[PDB]
Design a protein around this nucleic acid. Structure first.
Ligand SMILES: [Zn+2]
Length: 675
RNA sequence: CUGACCCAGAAGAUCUACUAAGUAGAUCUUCUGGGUCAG
């Protein structure tokens, strides 16, 4: 067995006395071993004829798997039964039997929330010890806070039932939105009241060993200037002005559709303005249907082109011009392949007029982003000293990951790097996700003397996922809150590590400095909190809990009533009628389908399975997809592709999700498909 | 029964920017249901 260190025993001492404590310690010091020692001590203390039950909470699937493996390997000699339940192993055996027939259970919090809501698990008195991993998430409406709401409701209710001991592990408690030390202390007291903790455990008497184990890197700040001359922006701005004039020609009241004033090309404000203008122009209703459809389609096309131009400008701001030009070229290829009509022909011709000059400018070596030059210089200088350096690079968007991988591959001066890619799992409109096996494979590859020595990743590599030690951390316009600042800096635990922040905006550096001051405030508040008498702390925590319980008991609100009137669904691009709400059927309360032979004439299928589009020529707006249910193969529609119009009043409305649209939902009937 | 892949819903946290708490864009995570291939 592994020999515990002195500071690990110091951290575990308050928990071995039966107190609810929060354990704060740097990442990489071995808090999992501390939890193992606490669990071992807890299970052995019960007298003959009595047993204890331990539940461990993890927020991510890989963390859950690793913890289950570690616990099973550790406690198999003692004769304890260890199991785990998650999304991939939930609907197999009843949860109550699994809980009753085991000693140590590893869980994702949502499973326990679901089973507490259904009534499968009537109370938390079955467990004798609860362990929360990354316990700083116990706030607002997190599942951790739902479990703690159940716990606190049982506690402050007069029910004379035993309750488990609660242990939390974290590397940073955070300050919330505190500005001074008093507010930080108030926030930390609130967090302690959330977990019912009366002790905060830190390393005091064995600091030298911890500093010998975990090393804190040095933080640097680099500020660069923007491009002096930008012909790319000039050309795109001229095109954007021409498109705005074309839009104003058709709609004379364009400038009164939004209240945003003094908009500028290539900013988030302009994006918000154009989104609002798009949402305003898709509602216009006029007595003549053909001319209304013409105007609406024209405005749709104009606004879409303006939005794409703004996106290209932003991409060019944060990356090379080649990436923005490729983005525009892909959009224009899709537009050409997506219903070429006279307005689309005009827009495409106007773009091809300036395409040659755009391609000429982006290939000039003297127009490169200064941020890229600074990053290349940093990488060269760092890898010259240590050829065995391991690096991690943090970025904001999924497109930047691919752009920087391409730039690194194509850079003749960075031939010593082997980039790796790490993004999230969810699928976006422009990007596909990453599966768990792919992430695991790339993480296994990314190590010293391996296939990769530099990793480009989004915020997926912030928490939970384990990564080999890095001697270099680089932040590319990457600043968040104090918790994220502590988490990102903790990945460079190798001795002599450095952390760099790269930006061209002074506000980012100012915010990082404010974060560095907030960390000192938090440490001061924690140090002050430990000098109080425990009874006073208990009284304050009880008062906070009582107030919060009263507020949350008074906050509950009811649900309104849906509307039974019939409605029409119209194509969002061309305003053509698609179907009525009387034809809509719901499959298993989560799939929406349209029944009837009239709807089959309003769409066409173009090949996963085939999607469905608007049948009207030159529109081809996306409406949904074909799915398989039992024997039937039926299409499903998306509410965000249609405009909802009332039959009587005639007012048109927009919805983004099916739960916002309140109408009578008739369940799907297999035998109904005969009328 | 295991792996691998996809689709449709819903929930949560974080950041930025607007308006008079709400909204828009982005990032990550989780749960539920429906299908495909191989062994
Ligand atoms: Zn259409």
């Amino acid at each position: 067995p592994f020999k515990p260190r002195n500071y690990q025993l110091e951290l575990a001492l308050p928990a071995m006395k039966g107190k609810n404590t929060i354990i704060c310690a740097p990442t990489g010091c071995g808090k999992t071993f501390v939890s193992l020692l606490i669990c071992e001590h807890h299970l052995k203390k019960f007298p003959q004829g009595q047993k204890g039950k331990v539940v461990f909470f993890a927020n991510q699937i890989p963390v859950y798997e690793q913890q289950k493996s570690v616990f099973s390997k550790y406690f198999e000699r003692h004769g304890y039964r260890v199991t785990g339940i998650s999304g991939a192993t939930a609907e197999n055996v009843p949860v109550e039997q699994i809980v009753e027939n085991n000693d140590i259970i590893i869980l994702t919090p949502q499973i326990l929330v679901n089973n507490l809501k259904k009534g499968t698990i009537p109370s938390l008195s079955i467990f004798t010890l609860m362990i929360f991993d990354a316990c700083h998430n116990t706030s607002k409406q997190h599942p951790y806070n739902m479990i703690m709401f159940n716990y606190l409701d049982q506690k402050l209710g007069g029910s004379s039932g035993p309750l488990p001991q609660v242990i939390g592990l974290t590397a940073s408690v955070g300050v919330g939105d505190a500005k001074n030390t008093d507010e930080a202390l108030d926030y930390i007291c609130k967090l302690c009241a959330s977990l019912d903790a009366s002790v905060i455990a830190t390393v005091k008497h064995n600091l030298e060993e911890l500093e010998q184990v975990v090393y804190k890197p040095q933080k640097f700040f680099r500020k660069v200037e923007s491009r002096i001359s930008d012909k790319f922006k000039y050309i795109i701005a001229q095109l954007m002005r021409d498109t705005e004039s074309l839009a104003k020609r058709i709609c004379k009241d364009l400038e009164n559709l939004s209240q945003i004033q003094n908009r500028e090309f290539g900013t988030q404000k302009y994006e918000q303005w154009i989104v609002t203008v798009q949402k305003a122009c898709m509602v216009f209703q006029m007595p003549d249907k053909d001319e209304e459809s013409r105007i609406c389609k024209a405005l749709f096309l104009y606004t879409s082109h303006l939005r794409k131009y703004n996106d290209a400008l932003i991409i060019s701001e944060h990356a090379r011009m080649k990436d923005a030009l490729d983005y525009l070229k892909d959009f224009f290829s899709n537009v050409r392949a997506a219903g070429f009509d006279e307005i689309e022909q005009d827009l495409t011709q106007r773009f091809e007029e300036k395409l040659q000059e755009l391609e000429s400018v982006s290939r000039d070596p003297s127009n490169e982003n200064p941020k890229l030059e600074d990053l290349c210089f940093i990488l060269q200088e760092e890898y010259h000293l240590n050829p065995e350096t391991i690096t991690i690079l943090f970025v904001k968007t999924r497109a930047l990951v691919d752009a920087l991988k391409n730039w690194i591959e194509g850079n003749p001066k960075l031939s010593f790097l082997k980039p790796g890619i790490l993004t999230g799992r969810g699928k976006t409109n422009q990007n596909t996700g990453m599966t768990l096996p792919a992430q695991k494979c790339i993480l296994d590859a990314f190590k010293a003397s391996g296939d990769h020595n530099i990793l480009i990743a989004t915020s997926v590599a912030d928490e939970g996922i384990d990564i080999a030690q890095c001697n270099l951390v680089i932040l590319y316009e990457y600043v968040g809150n104090v918790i994220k600042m502590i988490q990102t800096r903790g990945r460079g635990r190798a001795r002599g590590s450095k952390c760099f922040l790269l930006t061209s905006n002074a506000g980012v550096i100012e915010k990082e400095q404010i974060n560095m001051y907030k960390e000192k405030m938090m440490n001061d508040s924690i140090l002050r909190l430990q000098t109080w008498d425990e009874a006073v702390f208990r009284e304050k925590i009880l008062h906070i809990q009582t107030h919060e319980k009263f507020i949350r008991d008074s906050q509950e609100k009811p649900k309104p009533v849906p509307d039974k009137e019939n409605k029409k669904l119209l194509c969002r691009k061309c305003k053509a009628l698609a179907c009525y709400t009387a034809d809509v059927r719901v499959i298993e309360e989560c799939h929406y389908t349209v029944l009837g032979d009239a709807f089959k004439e309003c769409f066409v299928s173009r090949p996963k399975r085939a999607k469905i589009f608007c049948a009207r020529q030159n529109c081809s707006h996306d409406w949904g997809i074909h799915v398989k249910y039992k024997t039937f193969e039926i299409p499903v529609i998306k509410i965000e592709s249609f405009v909802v119009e009332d039959i009587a009043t005639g007012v048109q409305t927009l919805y983004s999700k099916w739960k916002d649209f309140h109408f009578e939902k008739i369940p799907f009937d297999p035998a109904e498909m005969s009328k």
